[model samples]
Target chain A: FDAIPDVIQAFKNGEFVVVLDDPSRENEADLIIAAESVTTEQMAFMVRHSSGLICAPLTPERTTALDLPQMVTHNADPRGTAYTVSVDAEHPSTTTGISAHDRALACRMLAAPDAQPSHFRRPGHVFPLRAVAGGVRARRGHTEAGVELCRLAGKRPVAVISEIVDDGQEVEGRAVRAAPGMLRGDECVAFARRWGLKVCTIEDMIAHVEKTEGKL
Target chain B: FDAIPDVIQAFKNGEFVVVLDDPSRENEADLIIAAESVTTEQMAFMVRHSSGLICAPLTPERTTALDLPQMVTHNADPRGTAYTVSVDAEHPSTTTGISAHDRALACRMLAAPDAQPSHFRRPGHVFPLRAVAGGVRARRGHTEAGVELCRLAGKRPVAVISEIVDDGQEVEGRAVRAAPGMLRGDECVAFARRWGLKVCTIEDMIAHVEKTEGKL
Candidate 1:
């Protein structure tokens, strides 16, 4: 039970929001931020806390316009996430695009409607995701959730998303981990609370969109 | 007294050694690793534990051959650390050279005698440091200290050095910091011991070199 308006307001203020999917879905939480307003410090914090595979969710039309084609003919991700080719902003100042500063710039470039394909070099650091046509109403996943949230926040429908991974338990002054650790439901809540971020679920987003704009 | 042979052995084995400088000098500990054998994970660890400013110490000849000139005509650093213009590997696969992997590759390239100026793009992620000709004996600093250590290990005289910074105290599950927290001597010793890394001093290095090879 997330307050949709509050989440949208927080996002519009250029703050990160923790978006949780249904337990039966990816069973994970994604930290989403407006790509257009992402800062270097924010990107660095996100990278440190998440899986480090930062992806920007863009509308399919925008993706095609930006010349970002599907990475593969068939989506092989367990969740079938529609991944576009990776890209880094093509600017002399965008040095070694893996730095948080460079990645933030790359994310900002992706959100620019006037940005052309030549503005970015393919197969770089930041990965781009193609959102469904109807967004959350079309697909109940974090990618669509990000796009829909951006739309609600009056952004350019491009939002950064990264799966929140557990930093794991600290044992004797060291962080110890076993297997791939993605943050779960309660863990996501605690993380959001700890960071003063709002947590909204894809289901909540879908309901809010339908309530405001009628059934898709 | 720092064990000179043990430090050299550990460094030759591709391990990070903490180098402490005189209290009257920089009074800091730098995490040093052989640039030629640095791995992505090792680079990442160094970046995490130390100040994010990773620098590669190289001889003047290699720096000139690689077309890396002094970043500034005059060395203005408090310790007079000779910094060269930044560089990234000029390979197609070196996507946005700020990633740990790309930086590691760039370091390796800098260590390669055959690597030409064309192999790197200036003003990128990895910053090259111009070490003094006589190394530790001439200049008692981390930059020269790194070079001398590499020479002792029989590796290319290019080692990565970054000042270790305090992570600060964790306050209620948050890393709380005050001011710019550089790790001092005792702190550096604790850090090396916790990580099982060898710790040595620049003075010790200078003594070892002079005793073995006579005065420069």
Candidate 2:
């Protein structure tokens, strides 16, 4: 939407914010919203933009709070592997104020659920933050950006999202391929093109957040 | 199984072959089997190794002869955006001699299907072959590899393969994360670590093929 200003404002107000982490890859960035403050548009966007399942940040405390599924594997986690639960099911979740997609994304990532396709990494976003003891750092996928976002939300539980681009039905532009366990940079960019979505960086989004606070 | 010799023999005999493309990525390579020489072991492997989805290469002819679905975007097709299909449904397919997994994977990669969460540079794999037109070239996945395979198989119509990895339940080593859209190099390696899977390049596989032919 090129609505970085609005996106930033949304983030400031504790709403969902979507941006591209790597424009060259044009892939999905963390939807970076407070786990407590999620949105439907962001939920839909997660499903729409990703070719993998949507995921969120989670800690053991939040795990029971959300009733997430068992942990899959500890292969990717530097800490003990984090647990996941798919919040995207037809049966409603006890976690209030979230959509199934949001719910799943969060239980897996936040208090989210629905899916955690095997291809993505594990103990993915939040666990990294707690172990590293800081927010996001670089142009890395949801890990760096996802942590940075949690820090912004006052270190609240955050969501690092990824969805397995079901829009394969909708993509008619450059052909996008799905590798299933990893987010190749090009596939994300291709998905953006399929929807005529633009690429914006975290810095650009942060600038808009600053501007919205002062100018907008 | 570390059975490179067997894999090469299968390829020479026009049977299914599965080999890791990027030695380092060890995550999940395309089933890398042929559409025409589909096998149950291949069908079993898609679910065994992958998390999000499995995909295949599709040419225009096979898509229709197989009634392949409409293709999605080809944004990542530099060498070529190989057509892909998913193999994750309960229904039987008009595509004969293939499993439901094969049918679904074909529909997704060939006709293009639902969102596979990860990406690894278009459907990829390399099987050096006998092309009447040309010898195999450098750094290519299944489309280039698949086409070469098809030509070797007496020009049989074939569908490229892809399947959304549903291995979230099966994996037990460490927690796995999915950024969905692409296979991060380390994620592949990480999965290999979790399951003790080995990583060998197309060249290594090809070398094994050559070795088998020379000795056997």
Candidate 3:
């Protein structure tokens, strides 16, 4: 048997203590508490054993410091649906990517007419193909393509750029490749002009690209 | 000159009225307050010849349906920052989107140090993407690529795709095409699978991609 110092100590101290055949096994417990530092997979395991869950205090970046109490309260609300509870628990700032499997679960929850309005919102626009350091770069005319795509999709076109950087290293005097389409060939120069973007040297665009893609 | 029948009637009925003018302009009246719907932008013009700011009921969105005295009080507090005002006004049922811009704003307002812990403490996550009909989906391999990119960038992947469907619609088919890393030649797929995704077929993945892109 695994060492049970904490359990023995609690029992000797006259506090309730419970143990399972498998610590990872699913069991019905009144409360399942975990550290915020737990990985998503570990959280998933702990969630299987309890009706209520608690996480230890976490730094602001790793966990949303303000939302912990609300999560506990939301979990306890009898009127709350499973998805709401899950959403409340699995929000980005709390759960690791463990609930990635629960995307469907969350979707089903969102389908309910009574489901509260989601704090999440759709992006107003996307600037695909915009070049970044070692990441993908938009071909020249793709700015218009991105804009047209947004318009066709009924969204807004906020800004455009000629090139972006991704996770690549520096190269001297190398030709940057366009992702293709109308912006292909020398036409990229003209497309950039039409969109009123600066005629950046490949190097200059690469630098800007690096910054955009640096943090992913 | 615009007719002020309500003001005239009120005046005839011996009701009090006040006319106000902009202090900056010596001869210009800024507005007129009376029991009428005001349309023009010039406040001075309305007030110069009329009463004071119109005392109409707040818009339905602004008003609470309950009859509590505290609920009915509108001018109670004049203090608080812009984020506080935003938190008070936010309805969870309306927001959508998962882009950086949207997420950044939410983070600042709800997840920041100064934010009210209770207001946003419940799990909140934003998946900023293009709109789709059913739910957010991943672009072919883009989701995988996104995960890899996040890992490379030293950020955890907070979202993922779980399912894919096809209805044989042009828009649906085209939706798949627009995604950056979903195609056969795209690079995001390998990245995604390497990061432990149970990859699915391109055809089935389109809807999920569309949803992830925020197509709806």
Candidate 4:
């Protein structure tokens, strides 16, 4: 039984989906929601569970159409994630631009098909990632997975994602380690179960897309 | 030939005065002007010659009245210069607030005795320094010296000061040293002489104040 359909249905209902990546690659679980329908409460929930670095995934064409270029000339991310310049909604509702409400507005604006470049303030709080064209078939990362999942659910191709982190893992001494703070695979599943949300992985998502949609 | 009188005359005439501190202390020359009388061009000139870190020195009472508290509780500056929260004039003219014109307006606003806390935007380009009550006798730093000079000149007790730095000092190897980039005493004198501006020392100012108005 492919639980991706349930995850897709949950996403269509404006619910969160836990998309875990390969353990060999980043080994992280991302809590994602449809950017076009993300509410302030949902954004606050995601921010509380994750490291608070909220990112929206968009196709390269959409990013370019919105005049959002790459953050830097040289991409230095180890995962080859093409990060676009951050932005915030330039509406009157946007104050300070760091609040969950403001970020939710920015995410929805990012997913708006007819949104113009002038609709946002450059170098803002919401970070946008430029996903490759072929989706999960081209890249096996959470950025592509989230966008592909949103597309498969017949929603906007943009999805907001944040890496889930272990809430209580304090150390008495020594520097912080990456693995210690990160929520493990079992922990991610447990989190989804606890929240009554559906959890899926990039490998399973790729397999489903290849089987049904006949692979990009 | 006490040049303190000439320096005071230049200050009263709304001209720049080069104030050099003690060689044993910070050993730095500050290009200073009365904050009340500073023009945009004069501010631009000061920024071009100095490190561009424009500081408006005000008495502790004035700083408190303006509601500009110290930047940090624990002062870590080597010179013990009490730096307050930076501010910008919250007027229509303050676009970006980094330009010389905007900074000049901010300086004049800071010097206004009736200026309220709401007149300025916090964490801006113009840095405010809270000078000690006793002036130069209390601290030999430029922060106190500038305010004391402004008070002696019958101007508002607020002065803008910027440390002069050498423009051309190319390093071939190793690392950048403090003394190399700093404008030496001789260079400061040459600069003042070249610009036909008056130059005075903290020692001469102290001597003149003690001889005429008594110590402190």
Reference-based lDDT, each prediction: 0.77, 0.37, 0.22, 0.75
lDDT of 4 by residue, A100-132 (tens): 677889999988888888887765657788889
Instruction: Quote the lDDT for A44 in model 1.
Output: 65
Candidate 2 on A42-87: residue-level lDDT in tens?
A: 4344433343234455443445454444433222222222324222
Which structure among the candidates has the greatest lDDT?
1
Q: Rank the candidates by TM-score, best first.
A: 1, 4, 2, 3
Clashes of each: 4, 115, 61, 0
Q: Residue by residue across A19-113, what tens digits does model 3's lDDT show?
A: 21111221111111111122222222222211101112111211221221122223321222111111222234421111312222232222222
Candidate 3 ranges with C-alpha deviation above 4 Å: A1-28, A34-44, A47-76, A79-96, A99-216, B1-131, B134-216
Clashing pairs in 1: A96-B96, A96-B97, A96-B98, A97-B96
Docking class of 4: incorrect
Between the candidate structures 1 and 3, which one is better when assessed by TM-score?
Answer: 1
DockQ (0 to 1) for model 4: 0.02
Query: How high is the TM-score of chain A in model 2?
Result: 0.46
lDDT of 2 at A5: 45
* Predicted complexes: DockQ each: 0.04, 0.03, 0.02, 0.02
Residues B1-216 of candidate 4 have per-residue lDDT tens digits of 227877887888778788898988767788888999787667656655565557899998888789887655544334556767557798886654555677889999998878888898765657788888877876877888788888888899899997775544322321111122457688888878777678888888888777766876
Model 2's alpha-carbon lDDT is 0.37
Residue A47 local lDDT, model 4: 57
Rank by lDDT (best first): 1, 4, 2, 3
